Write an enzyme that holds these catalytic residues in place. Structure first.
Site, PDB file in Angstrom:
ATOM      1  N   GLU A  35      50.965  64.806   9.881  1.00 25.06           N
ATOM      2  CA  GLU A  35      51.135  63.451  10.391  1.00 25.06           C
ATOM      3  C   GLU A  35      52.499  63.266  11.047  1.00 25.06           C
ATOM      4  O   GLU A  35      52.606  62.651  12.115  1.00 25.06           O
ATOM      5  CB  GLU A  35      50.952  62.451   9.256  1.00 25.06           C
ATOM      6  CG  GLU A  35      49.508  62.309   8.773  1.00 25.06           C
ATOM      7  CD  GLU A  35      48.622  61.564   9.763  1.00 25.06           C
ATOM      8  OE1 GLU A  35      49.129  61.104  10.803  1.00 25.06           O
ATOM      9  OE2 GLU A  35      47.406  61.481   9.513  1.00 25.06           O
ATOM     10  N   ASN A  46      49.467  53.667  19.028  1.00 27.25           N
ATOM     11  CA  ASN A  46      48.033  53.882  19.173  1.00 27.25           C
ATOM     12  C   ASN A  46      47.495  53.056  20.339  1.00 27.25           C
ATOM     13  O   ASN A  46      48.105  52.070  20.768  1.00 27.25           O
ATOM     14  CB  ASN A  46      47.299  53.493  17.890  1.00 27.25           C
ATOM     15  CG  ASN A  46      47.827  54.212  16.670  1.00 27.25           C
ATOM     16  OD1 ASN A  46      48.106  53.582  15.651  1.00 27.25           O
ATOM     17  ND2 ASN A  46      47.949  55.524  16.756  1.00 27.25           N
ATOM     18  N   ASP A  48      45.155  50.925  20.450  1.00 33.40           N
ATOM     19  CA  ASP A  48      44.839  49.527  20.171  1.00 33.40           C
ATOM     20  C   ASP A  48      46.071  48.635  20.120  1.00 33.40           C
ATOM     21  O   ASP A  48      45.935  47.434  19.856  1.00 33.40           O
ATOM     22  CB  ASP A  48      44.040  49.387  18.865  1.00 33.40           C
ATOM     23  CG  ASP A  48      44.830  49.789  17.632  1.00 33.40           C
ATOM     24  OD1 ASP A  48      45.995  50.222  17.752  1.00 33.40           O
ATOM     25  OD2 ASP A  48      44.279  49.657  16.516  1.00 33.40           O
ATOM     26  N   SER A  50      48.554  49.076  17.941  1.00 36.74           N
ATOM     27  CA  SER A  50      49.232  49.279  16.679  1.00 36.74           C
ATOM     28  C   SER A  50      50.149  50.499  16.777  1.00 36.74           C
ATOM     29  O   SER A  50      50.127  51.255  17.755  1.00 36.74           O
ATOM     30  CB  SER A  50      48.222  49.466  15.552  1.00 36.74           C
ATOM     31  OG  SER A  50      47.504  50.652  15.768  1.00 36.74           O
ATOM     32  N   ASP A  52      51.946  53.732  14.161  1.00 35.07           N
ATOM     33  CA  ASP A  52      51.967  54.473  12.900  1.00 35.07           C
ATOM     34  C   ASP A  52      53.411  54.797  12.544  1.00 35.07           C
ATOM     35  O   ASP A  52      54.165  55.268  13.402  1.00 35.07           O
ATOM     36  CB  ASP A  52      51.199  55.789  13.017  1.00 35.07           C
ATOM     37  CG  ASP A  52      49.748  55.590  13.357  1.00 35.07           C
ATOM     38  OD1 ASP A  52      49.175  54.593  12.887  1.00 35.07           O
ATOM     39  OD2 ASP A  52      49.178  56.435  14.074  1.00 35.07           O
ATOM     40  N   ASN A  59      49.699  52.725   9.399  1.00 39.76           N
ATOM     41  CA  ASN A  59      49.384  51.993  10.620  1.00 39.76           C
ATOM     42  C   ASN A  59      49.609  50.486  10.483  1.00 39.76           C
ATOM     43  O   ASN A  59      49.263  49.876   9.467  1.00 39.76           O
ATOM     44  CB  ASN A  59      47.931  52.266  11.004  1.00 39.76           C
ATOM     45  CG  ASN A  59      47.530  51.509  12.201  1.00 39.76           C
ATOM     46  OD1 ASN A  59      46.901  50.466  12.084  1.00 39.76           O
ATOM     47  ND2 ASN A  59      47.859  52.025  13.366  1.00 39.76           N
TER      48      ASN A  59
HETATM   49  C1  LIG Z   1      47.168  56.007   6.967  1.00 36.98           C
HETATM   50  C2  LIG Z   1      46.667  54.917   7.861  1.00 36.98           C
HETATM   51  O1  LIG Z   1      47.363  53.966   8.193  1.00 36.98           O
HETATM   52  N1  LIG Z   1      45.422  55.054   8.274  1.00 36.98           N
HETATM   53  C3  LIG Z   1      44.788  54.074   9.144  1.00 36.98           C
HETATM   54  C4  LIG Z   1      43.463  53.600   8.541  1.00 36.98           C
HETATM   55  O2  LIG Z   1      43.708  52.896   7.325  1.00 36.98           O
HETATM   56  C5  LIG Z   1      42.638  52.789   9.539  1.00 36.98           C
HETATM   57  O3  LIG Z   1      41.286  52.819   9.082  1.00 36.98           O
HETATM   58  C6  LIG Z   1      40.749  51.576   8.731  1.00 36.98           C
HETATM   59  O4  LIG Z   1      41.293  51.187   7.478  1.00 36.98           O
HETATM   60  C7  LIG Z   1      40.719  49.986   6.955  1.00 36.98           C
HETATM   61  C8  LIG Z   1      41.494  49.641   5.705  1.00 36.98           C
HETATM   62  O5  LIG Z   1      41.331  50.647   4.707  1.00 36.98           O
HETATM   63  C9  LIG Z   1      39.241  50.243   6.672  1.00 36.98           C
HETATM   64  O6  LIG Z   1      38.725  49.060   6.054  1.00 36.98           O
HETATM   65  C10 LIG Z   1      38.055  49.272   4.839  1.00 36.98           C
HETATM   66  O7  LIG Z   1      36.775  49.842   5.085  1.00 36.98           O
HETATM   67  C11 LIG Z   1      36.027  50.151   3.895  1.00 36.98           C
HETATM   68  C12 LIG Z   1      34.656  50.612   4.341  1.00 36.98           C
HETATM   69  O8  LIG Z   1      34.702  51.771   5.166  1.00 36.98           O
HETATM   70  C13 LIG Z   1      35.925  48.991   2.899  1.00 36.98           C
HETATM   71  O9  LIG Z   1      35.585  49.511   1.615  1.00 36.98           O
HETATM   72  C14 LIG Z   1      37.225  48.196   2.776  1.00 36.98           C
HETATM   73  O10 LIG Z   1      36.987  46.938   2.155  1.00 36.98           O
HETATM   74  C15 LIG Z   1      37.928  47.948   4.110  1.00 36.98           C
HETATM   75  N2  LIG Z   1      39.239  47.346   3.882  1.00 36.98           N
HETATM   76  C16 LIG Z   1      39.596  46.168   4.380  1.00 36.98           C
HETATM   77  C17 LIG Z   1      38.582  45.475   5.243  1.00 36.98           C
HETATM   78  O11 LIG Z   1      40.693  45.670   4.149  1.00 36.98           O
HETATM   79  C18 LIG Z   1      38.481  50.628   7.935  1.00 36.98           C
HETATM   80  O12 LIG Z   1      37.181  51.119   7.625  1.00 36.98           O
HETATM   81  C19 LIG Z   1      39.231  51.698   8.732  1.00 36.98           C
HETATM   82  N3  LIG Z   1      38.733  51.782  10.101  1.00 36.98           N
HETATM   83  C20 LIG Z   1      38.262  52.913  10.605  1.00 36.98           C
HETATM   84  C21 LIG Z   1      37.783  52.847  12.024  1.00 36.98           C
HETATM   85  O13 LIG Z   1      38.224  53.952   9.955  1.00 36.98           O
HETATM   86  C22 LIG Z   1      42.612  53.410  10.936  1.00 36.98           C
HETATM   87  C23 LIG Z   1      41.984  52.565  12.022  1.00 36.98           C
HETATM   88  O14 LIG Z   1      42.752  51.423  12.381  1.00 36.98           O
HETATM   89  O15 LIG Z   1      43.955  53.680  11.347  1.00 36.98           O
HETATM   90  C24 LIG Z   1      44.574  54.661  10.540  1.00 36.98           C
HETATM   91  O16 LIG Z   1      45.780  55.018  11.133  1.00 36.98           O
END
Ligand SMILES: CC(=O)N[C@@H]1[C@@H](O)[C@H](O[C@@H]2O[C@H](CO)[C@@H](O[C@@H]3O[C@H](CO)[C@@H](O)[C@H](O)[C@H]3NC(C)=O)[C@H](O)[C@H]2NC(C)=O)[C@@H](CO)O[C@H]1O
Ligand SMILES: [Cl-]
Length: 129
Positions: A35, A46, A48, A50, A52, A59
């Protein structure tokens, strides 16, 4: 700060990441390597809008506030700049919440694509732990 491999391993263990949510220490060290190259100051924009931040590239769309990611959350309740410190406490505490949020370490793209399913134990070889 650019951590050494075993230096970072030891700091992560002290802050409780070895086997946190079932992920052995080598997983976390491997994640940090790909990373950030162990550089606490690493930042990357990124598509979008955002950014990291830090050793584990946390992120701004979900986890920290940098004042420039519209419609984002700050679920670790922390300024993103705190994730750039030479002291990794903030990054570890935020990582604990991330890896607890449903998808485990798959939240780290570099971990999924470069560490998952590999011999991550190699990342702590030779370390006095
Ligand atoms: C290390 C880092 O920053 N990684 C980033 C990721 O965290 C991010 O992925 C998205 O993260 C959110 C929060 O965890 C995910 O939401 C969760 O989704 C699951 C279901 O899959 C659910 O159980 C949770 O309630 C929900 N949390 C909420 C809504 O707060 C979301 O699925 C992720 N999105 C994707 C496309 O994977 C990604 C994308 O922005 O960025 C990384 O850098
Ligand atoms: Cl990748």
């Amino acid at each position: 700060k650019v951590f050494g491999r075993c230096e970072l391993a030891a700091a992560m263990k002290r802050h409780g990441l070895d086997n946190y949510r079932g992920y052995s220490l080598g997983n976390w060290v491997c994640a940090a390597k790909f990373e950030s190259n162990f550089n606490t100051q690493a930042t990357n924009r990124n598509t979008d809008g955002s950014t990291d931040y830090g050793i584990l590239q946390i992120n701004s769309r979900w986890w920290c506030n940098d004042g420039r990611t519209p419609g984002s959350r700050n679920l670790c309740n922390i300024p993103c700049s705190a994730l750039l410190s030479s002291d990794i406490t903030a990054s570890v505490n935020c990582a604990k919440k991330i890896v607890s949020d449903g998808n485990g370490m798959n939240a780290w793209v570099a971990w999924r694509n470069r560490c998952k399913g590999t011999d991550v134990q190699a990342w702590i070889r030779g370390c006095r732990l």
